PDB file of C-alpha atoms in Angstrom:
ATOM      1  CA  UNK A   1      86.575 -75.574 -55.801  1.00 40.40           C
ATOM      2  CA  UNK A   2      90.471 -75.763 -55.989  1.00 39.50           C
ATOM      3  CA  UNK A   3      92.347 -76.981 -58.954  1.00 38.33           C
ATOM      4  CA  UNK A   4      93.013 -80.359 -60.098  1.00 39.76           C
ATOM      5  CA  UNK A   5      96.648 -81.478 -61.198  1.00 38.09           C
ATOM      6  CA  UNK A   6      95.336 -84.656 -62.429  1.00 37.94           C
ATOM      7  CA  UNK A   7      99.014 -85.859 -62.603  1.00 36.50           C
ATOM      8  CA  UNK A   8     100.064 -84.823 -59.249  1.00 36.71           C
ATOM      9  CA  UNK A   9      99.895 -87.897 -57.420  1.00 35.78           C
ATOM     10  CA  UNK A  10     101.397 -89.752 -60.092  1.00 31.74           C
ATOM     11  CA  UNK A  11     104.383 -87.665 -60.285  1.00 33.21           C
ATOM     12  CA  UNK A  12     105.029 -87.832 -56.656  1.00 33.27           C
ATOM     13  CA  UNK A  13     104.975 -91.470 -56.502  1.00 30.99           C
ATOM     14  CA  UNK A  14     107.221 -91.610 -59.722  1.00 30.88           C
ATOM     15  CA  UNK A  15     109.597 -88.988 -57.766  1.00 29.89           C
ATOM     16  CA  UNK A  16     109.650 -90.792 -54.012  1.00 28.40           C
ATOM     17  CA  UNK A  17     110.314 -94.347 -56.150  1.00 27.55           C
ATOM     18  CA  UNK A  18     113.605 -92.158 -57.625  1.00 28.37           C
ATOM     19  CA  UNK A  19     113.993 -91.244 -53.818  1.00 29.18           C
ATOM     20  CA  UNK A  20     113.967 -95.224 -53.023  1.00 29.62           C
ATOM     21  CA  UNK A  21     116.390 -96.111 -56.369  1.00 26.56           C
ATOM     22  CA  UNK A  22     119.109 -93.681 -54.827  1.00 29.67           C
ATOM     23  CA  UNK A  23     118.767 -94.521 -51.336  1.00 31.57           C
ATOM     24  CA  UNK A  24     117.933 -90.897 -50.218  1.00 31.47           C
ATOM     25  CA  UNK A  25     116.008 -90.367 -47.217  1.00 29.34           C
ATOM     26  CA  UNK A  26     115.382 -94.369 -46.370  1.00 29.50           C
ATOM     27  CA  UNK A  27     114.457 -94.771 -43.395  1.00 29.25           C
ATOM     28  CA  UNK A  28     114.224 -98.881 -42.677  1.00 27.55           C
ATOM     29  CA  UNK A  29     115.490-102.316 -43.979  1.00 26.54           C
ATOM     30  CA  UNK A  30     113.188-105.091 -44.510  1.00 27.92           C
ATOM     31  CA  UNK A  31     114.585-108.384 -43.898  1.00 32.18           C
ATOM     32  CA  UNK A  32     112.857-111.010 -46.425  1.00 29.06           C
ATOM     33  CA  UNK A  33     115.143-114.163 -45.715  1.00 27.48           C
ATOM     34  CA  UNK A  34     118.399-113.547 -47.162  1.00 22.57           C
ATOM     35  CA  UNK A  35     117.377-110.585 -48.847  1.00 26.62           C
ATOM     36  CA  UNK A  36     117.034-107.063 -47.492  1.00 27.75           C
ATOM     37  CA  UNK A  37     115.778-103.996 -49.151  1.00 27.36           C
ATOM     38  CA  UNK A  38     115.143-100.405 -48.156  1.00 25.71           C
ATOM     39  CA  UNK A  39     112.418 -98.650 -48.333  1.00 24.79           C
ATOM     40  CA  UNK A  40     110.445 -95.065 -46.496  1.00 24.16           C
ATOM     41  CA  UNK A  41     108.283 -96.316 -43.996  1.00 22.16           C
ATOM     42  CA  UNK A  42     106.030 -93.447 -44.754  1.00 20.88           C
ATOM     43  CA  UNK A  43     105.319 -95.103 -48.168  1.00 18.13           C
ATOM     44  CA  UNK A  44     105.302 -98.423 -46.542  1.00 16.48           C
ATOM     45  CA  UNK A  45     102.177 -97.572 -43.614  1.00 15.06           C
ATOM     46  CA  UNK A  46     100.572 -95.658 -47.141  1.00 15.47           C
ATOM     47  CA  UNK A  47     100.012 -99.016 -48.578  1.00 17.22           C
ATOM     48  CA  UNK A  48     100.323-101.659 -45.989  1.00 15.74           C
ATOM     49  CA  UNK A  49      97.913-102.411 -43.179  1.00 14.92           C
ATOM     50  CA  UNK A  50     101.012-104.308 -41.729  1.00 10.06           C
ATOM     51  CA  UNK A  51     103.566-101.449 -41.903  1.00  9.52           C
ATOM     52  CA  UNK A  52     100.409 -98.958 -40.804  1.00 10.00           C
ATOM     53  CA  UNK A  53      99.849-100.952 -37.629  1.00 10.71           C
ATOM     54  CA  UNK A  54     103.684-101.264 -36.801  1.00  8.08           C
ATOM     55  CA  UNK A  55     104.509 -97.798 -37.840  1.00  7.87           C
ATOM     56  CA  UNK A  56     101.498 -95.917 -36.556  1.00 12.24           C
ATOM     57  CA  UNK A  57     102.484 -97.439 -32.789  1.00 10.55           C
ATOM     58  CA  UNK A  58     104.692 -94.962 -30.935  1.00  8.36           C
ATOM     59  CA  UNK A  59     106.646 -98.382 -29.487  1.00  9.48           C
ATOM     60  CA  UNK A  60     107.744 -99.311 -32.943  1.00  7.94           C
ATOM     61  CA  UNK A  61     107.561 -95.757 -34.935  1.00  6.31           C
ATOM     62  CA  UNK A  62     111.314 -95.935 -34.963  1.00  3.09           C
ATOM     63  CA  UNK A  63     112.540 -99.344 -35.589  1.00  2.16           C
ATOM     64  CA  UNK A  64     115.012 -99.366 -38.650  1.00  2.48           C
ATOM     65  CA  UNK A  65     114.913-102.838 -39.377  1.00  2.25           C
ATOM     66  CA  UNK A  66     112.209-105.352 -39.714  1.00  2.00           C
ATOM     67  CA  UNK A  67     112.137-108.947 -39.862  1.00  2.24           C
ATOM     68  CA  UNK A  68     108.993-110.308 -42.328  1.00  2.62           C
ATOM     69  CA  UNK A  69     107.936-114.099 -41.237  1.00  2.00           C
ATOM     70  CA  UNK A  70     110.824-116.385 -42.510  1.00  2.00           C
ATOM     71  CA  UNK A  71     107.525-117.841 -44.593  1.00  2.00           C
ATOM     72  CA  UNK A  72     107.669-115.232 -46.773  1.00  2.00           C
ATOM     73  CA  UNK A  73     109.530-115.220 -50.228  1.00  4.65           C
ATOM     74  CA  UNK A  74     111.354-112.471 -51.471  1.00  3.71           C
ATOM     75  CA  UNK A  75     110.434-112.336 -54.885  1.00  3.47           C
ATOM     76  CA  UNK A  76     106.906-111.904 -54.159  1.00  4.93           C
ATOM     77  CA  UNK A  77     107.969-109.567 -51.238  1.00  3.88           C
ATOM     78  CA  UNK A  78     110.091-107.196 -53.812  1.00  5.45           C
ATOM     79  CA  UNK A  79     106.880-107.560 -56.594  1.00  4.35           C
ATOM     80  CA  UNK A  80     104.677-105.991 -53.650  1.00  4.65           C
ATOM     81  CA  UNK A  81     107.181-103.268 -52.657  1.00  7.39           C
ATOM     82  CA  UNK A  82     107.480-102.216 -56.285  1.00  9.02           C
ATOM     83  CA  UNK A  83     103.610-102.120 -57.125  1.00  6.82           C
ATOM     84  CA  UNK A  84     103.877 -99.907 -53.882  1.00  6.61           C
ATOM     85  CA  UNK A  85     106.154 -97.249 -55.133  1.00  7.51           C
ATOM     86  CA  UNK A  86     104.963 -97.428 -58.697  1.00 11.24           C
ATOM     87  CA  UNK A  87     100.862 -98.423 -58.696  1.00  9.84           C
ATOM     88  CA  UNK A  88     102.144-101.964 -61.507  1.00  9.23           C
ATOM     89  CA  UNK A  89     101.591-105.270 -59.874  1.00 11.49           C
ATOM     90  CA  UNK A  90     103.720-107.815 -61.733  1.00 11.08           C
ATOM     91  CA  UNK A  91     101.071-110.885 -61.366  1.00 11.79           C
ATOM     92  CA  UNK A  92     101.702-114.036 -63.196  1.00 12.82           C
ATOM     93  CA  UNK A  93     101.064-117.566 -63.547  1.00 14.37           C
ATOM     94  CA  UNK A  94     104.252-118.680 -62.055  1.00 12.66           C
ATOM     95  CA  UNK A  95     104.196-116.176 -59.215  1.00 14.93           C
ATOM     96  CA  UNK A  96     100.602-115.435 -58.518  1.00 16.10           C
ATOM     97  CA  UNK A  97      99.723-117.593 -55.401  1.00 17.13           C
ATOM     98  CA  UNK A  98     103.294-116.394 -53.548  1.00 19.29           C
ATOM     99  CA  UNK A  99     102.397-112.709 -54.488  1.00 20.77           C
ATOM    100  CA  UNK A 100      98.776-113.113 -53.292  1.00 19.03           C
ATOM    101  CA  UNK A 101     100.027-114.985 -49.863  1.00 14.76           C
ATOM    102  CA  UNK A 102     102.288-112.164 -49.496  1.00 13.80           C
ATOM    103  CA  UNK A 103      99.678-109.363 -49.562  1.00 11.24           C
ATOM    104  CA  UNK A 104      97.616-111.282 -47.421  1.00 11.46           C
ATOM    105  CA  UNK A 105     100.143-111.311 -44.881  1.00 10.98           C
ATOM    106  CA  UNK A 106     101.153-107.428 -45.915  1.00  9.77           C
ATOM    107  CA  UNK A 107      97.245-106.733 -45.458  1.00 10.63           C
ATOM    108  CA  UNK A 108      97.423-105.138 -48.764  1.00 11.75           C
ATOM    109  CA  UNK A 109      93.039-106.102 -49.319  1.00 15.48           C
ATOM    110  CA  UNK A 110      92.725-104.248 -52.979  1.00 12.25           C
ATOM    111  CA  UNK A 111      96.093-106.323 -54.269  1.00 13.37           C
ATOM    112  CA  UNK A 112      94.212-109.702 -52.571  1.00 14.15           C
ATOM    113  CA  UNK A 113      91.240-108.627 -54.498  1.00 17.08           C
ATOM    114  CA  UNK A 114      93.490-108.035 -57.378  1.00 16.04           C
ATOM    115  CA  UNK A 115      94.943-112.234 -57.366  1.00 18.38           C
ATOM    116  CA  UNK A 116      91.734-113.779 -56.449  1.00 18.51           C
ATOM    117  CA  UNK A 117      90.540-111.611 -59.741  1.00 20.87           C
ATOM    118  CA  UNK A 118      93.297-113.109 -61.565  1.00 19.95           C
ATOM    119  CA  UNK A 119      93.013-116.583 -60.365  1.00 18.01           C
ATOM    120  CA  UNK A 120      89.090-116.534 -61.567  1.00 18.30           C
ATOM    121  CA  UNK A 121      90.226-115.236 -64.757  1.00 20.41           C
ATOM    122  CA  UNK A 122      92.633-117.763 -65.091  1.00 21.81           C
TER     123      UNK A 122
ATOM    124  CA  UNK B   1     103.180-105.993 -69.344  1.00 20.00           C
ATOM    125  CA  UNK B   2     101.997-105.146 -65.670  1.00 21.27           C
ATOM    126  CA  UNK B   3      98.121-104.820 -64.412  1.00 19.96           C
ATOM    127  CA  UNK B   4      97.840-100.819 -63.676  1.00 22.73           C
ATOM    128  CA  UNK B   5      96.013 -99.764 -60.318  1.00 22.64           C
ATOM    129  CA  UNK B   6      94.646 -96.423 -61.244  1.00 24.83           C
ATOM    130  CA  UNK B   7      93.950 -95.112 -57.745  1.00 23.24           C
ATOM    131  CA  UNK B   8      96.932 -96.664 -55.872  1.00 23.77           C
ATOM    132  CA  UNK B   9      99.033 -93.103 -56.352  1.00 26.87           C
ATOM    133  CA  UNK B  10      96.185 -90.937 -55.148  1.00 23.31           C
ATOM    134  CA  UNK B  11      95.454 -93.474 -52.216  1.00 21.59           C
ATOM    135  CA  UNK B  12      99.467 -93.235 -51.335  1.00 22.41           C
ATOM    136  CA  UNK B  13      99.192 -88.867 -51.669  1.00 21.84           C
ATOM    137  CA  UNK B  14      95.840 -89.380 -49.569  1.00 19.98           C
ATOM    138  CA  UNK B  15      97.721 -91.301 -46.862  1.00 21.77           C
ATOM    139  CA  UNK B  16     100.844 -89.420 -47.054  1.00 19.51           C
ATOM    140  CA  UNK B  17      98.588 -86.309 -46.059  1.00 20.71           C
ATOM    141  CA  UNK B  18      97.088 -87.804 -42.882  1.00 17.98           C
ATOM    142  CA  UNK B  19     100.372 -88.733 -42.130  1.00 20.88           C
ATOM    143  CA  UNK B  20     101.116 -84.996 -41.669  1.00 25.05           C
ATOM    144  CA  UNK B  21      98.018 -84.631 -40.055  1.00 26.28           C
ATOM    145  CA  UNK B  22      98.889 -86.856 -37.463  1.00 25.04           C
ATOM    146  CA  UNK B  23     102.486 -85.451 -36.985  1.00 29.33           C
ATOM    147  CA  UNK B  24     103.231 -89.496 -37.717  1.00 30.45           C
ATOM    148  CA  UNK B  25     107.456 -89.392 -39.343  1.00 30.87           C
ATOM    149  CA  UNK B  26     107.282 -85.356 -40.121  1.00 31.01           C
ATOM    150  CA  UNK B  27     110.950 -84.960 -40.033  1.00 33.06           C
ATOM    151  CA  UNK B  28     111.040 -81.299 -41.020  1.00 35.70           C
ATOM    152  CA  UNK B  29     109.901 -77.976 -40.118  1.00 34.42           C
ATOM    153  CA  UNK B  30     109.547 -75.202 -42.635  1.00 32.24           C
ATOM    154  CA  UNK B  31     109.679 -71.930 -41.035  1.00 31.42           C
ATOM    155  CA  UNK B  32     107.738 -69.146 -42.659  1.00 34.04           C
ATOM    156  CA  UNK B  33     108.185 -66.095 -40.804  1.00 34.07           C
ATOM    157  CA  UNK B  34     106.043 -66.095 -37.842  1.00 32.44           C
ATOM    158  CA  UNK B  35     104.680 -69.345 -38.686  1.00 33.58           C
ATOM    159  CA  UNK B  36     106.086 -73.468 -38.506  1.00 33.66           C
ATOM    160  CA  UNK B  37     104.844 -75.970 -41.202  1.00 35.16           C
ATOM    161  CA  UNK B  38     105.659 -79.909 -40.161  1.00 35.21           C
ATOM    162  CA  UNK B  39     106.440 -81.974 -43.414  1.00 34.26           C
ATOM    163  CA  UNK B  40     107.862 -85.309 -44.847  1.00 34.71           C
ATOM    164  CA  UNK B  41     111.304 -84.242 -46.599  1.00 34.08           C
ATOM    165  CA  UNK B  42     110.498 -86.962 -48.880  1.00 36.82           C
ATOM    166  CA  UNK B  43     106.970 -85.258 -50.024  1.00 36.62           C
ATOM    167  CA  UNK B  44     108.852 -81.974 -50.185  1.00 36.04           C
ATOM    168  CA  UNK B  45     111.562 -83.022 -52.733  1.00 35.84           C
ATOM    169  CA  UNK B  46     109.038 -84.885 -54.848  1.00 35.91           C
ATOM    170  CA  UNK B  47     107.294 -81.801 -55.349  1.00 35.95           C
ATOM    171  CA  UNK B  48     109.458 -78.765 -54.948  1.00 35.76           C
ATOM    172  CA  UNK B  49     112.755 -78.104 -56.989  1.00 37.38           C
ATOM    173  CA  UNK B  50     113.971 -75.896 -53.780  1.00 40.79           C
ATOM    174  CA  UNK B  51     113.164 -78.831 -51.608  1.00 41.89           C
ATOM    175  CA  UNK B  52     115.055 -81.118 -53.764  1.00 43.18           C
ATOM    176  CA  UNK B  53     118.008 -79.140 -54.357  1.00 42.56           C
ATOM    177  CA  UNK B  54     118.203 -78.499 -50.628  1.00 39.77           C
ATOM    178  CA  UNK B  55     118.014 -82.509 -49.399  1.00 43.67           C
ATOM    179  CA  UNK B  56     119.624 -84.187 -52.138  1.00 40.75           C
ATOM    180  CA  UNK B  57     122.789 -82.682 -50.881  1.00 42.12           C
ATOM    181  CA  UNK B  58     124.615 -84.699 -48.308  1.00 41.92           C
ATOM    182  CA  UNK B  59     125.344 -81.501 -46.733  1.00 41.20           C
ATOM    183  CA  UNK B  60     121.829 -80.402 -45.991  1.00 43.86           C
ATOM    184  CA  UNK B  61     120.195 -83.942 -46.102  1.00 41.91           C
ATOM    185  CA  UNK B  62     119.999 -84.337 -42.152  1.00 42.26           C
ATOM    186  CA  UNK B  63     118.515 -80.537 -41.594  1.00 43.94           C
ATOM    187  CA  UNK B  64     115.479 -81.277 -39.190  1.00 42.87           C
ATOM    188  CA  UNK B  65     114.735 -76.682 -39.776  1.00 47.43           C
ATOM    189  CA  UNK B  66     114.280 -75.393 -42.917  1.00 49.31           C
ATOM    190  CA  UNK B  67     113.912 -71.090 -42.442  1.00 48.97           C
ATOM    191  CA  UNK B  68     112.578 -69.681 -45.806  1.00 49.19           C
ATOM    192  CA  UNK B  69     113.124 -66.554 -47.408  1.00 49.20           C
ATOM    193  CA  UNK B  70     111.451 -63.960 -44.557  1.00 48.32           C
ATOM    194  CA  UNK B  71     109.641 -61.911 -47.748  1.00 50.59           C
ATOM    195  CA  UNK B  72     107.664 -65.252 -48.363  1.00 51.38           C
ATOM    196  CA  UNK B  73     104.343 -65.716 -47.073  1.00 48.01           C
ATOM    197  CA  UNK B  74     102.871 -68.498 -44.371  1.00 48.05           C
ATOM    198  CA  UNK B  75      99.496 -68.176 -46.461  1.00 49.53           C
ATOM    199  CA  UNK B  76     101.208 -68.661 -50.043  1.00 51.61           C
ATOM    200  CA  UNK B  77     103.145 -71.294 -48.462  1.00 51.80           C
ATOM    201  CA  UNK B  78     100.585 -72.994 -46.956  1.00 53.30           C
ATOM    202  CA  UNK B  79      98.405 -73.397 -50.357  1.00 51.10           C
ATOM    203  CA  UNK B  80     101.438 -74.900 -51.782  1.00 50.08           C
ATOM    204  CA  UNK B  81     101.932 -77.397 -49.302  1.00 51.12           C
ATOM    205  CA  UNK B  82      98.539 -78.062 -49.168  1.00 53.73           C
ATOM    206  CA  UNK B  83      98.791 -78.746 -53.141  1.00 51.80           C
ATOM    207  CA  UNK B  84     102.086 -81.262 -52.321  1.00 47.86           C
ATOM    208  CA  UNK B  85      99.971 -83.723 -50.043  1.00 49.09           C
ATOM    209  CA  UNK B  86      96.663 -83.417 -51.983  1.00 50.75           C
ATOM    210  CA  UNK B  87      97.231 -82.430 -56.192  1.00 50.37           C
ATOM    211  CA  UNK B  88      94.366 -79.511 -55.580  1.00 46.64           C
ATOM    212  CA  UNK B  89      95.622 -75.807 -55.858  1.00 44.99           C
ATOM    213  CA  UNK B  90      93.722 -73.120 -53.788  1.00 44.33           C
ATOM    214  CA  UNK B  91      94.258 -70.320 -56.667  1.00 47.52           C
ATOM    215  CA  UNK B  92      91.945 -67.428 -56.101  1.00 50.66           C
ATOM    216  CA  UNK B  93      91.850 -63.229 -57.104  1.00 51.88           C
ATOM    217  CA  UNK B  94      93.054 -62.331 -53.712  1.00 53.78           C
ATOM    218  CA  UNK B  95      95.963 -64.934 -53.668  1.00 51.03           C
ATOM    219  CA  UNK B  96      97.329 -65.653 -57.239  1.00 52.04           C
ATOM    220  CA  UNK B  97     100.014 -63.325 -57.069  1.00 52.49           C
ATOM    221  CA  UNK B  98     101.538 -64.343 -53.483  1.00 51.80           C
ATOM    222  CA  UNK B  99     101.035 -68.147 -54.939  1.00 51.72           C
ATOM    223  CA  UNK B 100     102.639 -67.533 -57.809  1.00 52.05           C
ATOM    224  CA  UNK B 101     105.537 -65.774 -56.591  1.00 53.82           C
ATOM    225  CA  UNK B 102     105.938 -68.397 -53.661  1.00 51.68           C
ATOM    226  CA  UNK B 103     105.709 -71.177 -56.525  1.00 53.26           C
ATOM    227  CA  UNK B 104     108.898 -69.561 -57.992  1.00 53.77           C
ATOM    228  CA  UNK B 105     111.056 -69.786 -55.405  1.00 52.51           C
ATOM    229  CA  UNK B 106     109.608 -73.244 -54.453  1.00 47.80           C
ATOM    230  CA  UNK B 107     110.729 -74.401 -57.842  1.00 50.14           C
ATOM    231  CA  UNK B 108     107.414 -75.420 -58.964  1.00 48.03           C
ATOM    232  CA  UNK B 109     107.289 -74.871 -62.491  1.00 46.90           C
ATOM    233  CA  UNK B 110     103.890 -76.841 -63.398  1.00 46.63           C
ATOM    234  CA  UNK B 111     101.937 -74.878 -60.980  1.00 48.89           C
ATOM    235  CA  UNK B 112     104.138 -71.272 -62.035  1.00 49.30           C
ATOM    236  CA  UNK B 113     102.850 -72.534 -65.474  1.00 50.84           C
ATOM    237  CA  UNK B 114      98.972 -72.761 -63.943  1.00 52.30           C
ATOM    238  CA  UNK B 115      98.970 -69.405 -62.547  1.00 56.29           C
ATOM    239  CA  UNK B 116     100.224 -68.198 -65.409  1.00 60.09           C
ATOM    240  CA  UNK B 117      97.112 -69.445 -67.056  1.00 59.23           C
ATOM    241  CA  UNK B 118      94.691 -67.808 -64.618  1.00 57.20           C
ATOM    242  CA  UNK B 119      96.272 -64.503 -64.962  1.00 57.70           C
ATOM    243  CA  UNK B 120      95.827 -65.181 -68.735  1.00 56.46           C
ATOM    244  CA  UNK B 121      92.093 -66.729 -68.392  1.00 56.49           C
ATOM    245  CA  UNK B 122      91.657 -64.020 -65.607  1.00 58.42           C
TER     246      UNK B 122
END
């Protein structure tokens, strides 16, 4: 069988987060109420079953803005797109029910797995 | 400090690859002699020091054709690609050398290092 780099994947992810922090090769703004931040799409429909399903449709493939439900917070928007680009969920007590709301709406199931964990834990 | 998701990276590389496989926001072609290779700049640069060098640069950011070096191989190539999207290296007998020497001009000094070690274990 081939060989393993057992650090590959890591390192990419790592590397396309460096892509995000310098604004090279961004692709879309998502507009979380007042905020806005930029992201790849392709690592956006790689972790969300809401960007997959808007992405993956040749009628909205290249939109280069989105507009989240005015609902949603940005904090807990930002701590989602950050556990995206770097596998570290920041869950806490004072942010856990936004953040789980958030990847509900995302369709993020493994993060929604991840609060309800937390909130029996808890 | 914040709750680690040891999959998530491997899930995003796993994603990123059917991507490609679906042609869904390639936004590159790498021509290898008689042969064309779609690809995610972003992946590319993550992964490849050549690649990097090449779209960090304002100049050569936008390039949507990418012609390599008409000594290098589509075969070589391809492996190395392969290993971008997927952290598994196709090394074999009949291959190393063409990998290896395609890995140096890719910039890819971990997996220069790993043929280096199955010359040495070879």
């Amino acid at each position: 069988s081939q060989i393993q780099f057992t650090r590959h994947a890591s390192d990419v992810l790592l590397n396309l987060n460096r892509l995000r922090s310098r604004d090279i090769l961004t692709d879309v703004v998502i507009v979380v109420s007042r905020e806005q931040f930029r992201a790849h799409k392709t690592v956006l429909m790689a972790c969300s079953g809401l960007f997959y399903s808007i992405f993956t449709d040749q009628l909205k493939r290249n939109l280069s803005v989105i507009n989240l439900d005015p609902e949603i917070n940005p904090e807990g928007f930002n701590i989602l797109l950050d556990f995206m680009y770097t596998s570290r969920l920041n869950l806490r007590e004072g942010n856990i029910m936004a953040v789980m709301a958030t990847a509900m709406y995302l369709q993020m199931e493994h993060v929604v797995d991840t609060c309800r964990k937390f909130i029996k834990a808890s």
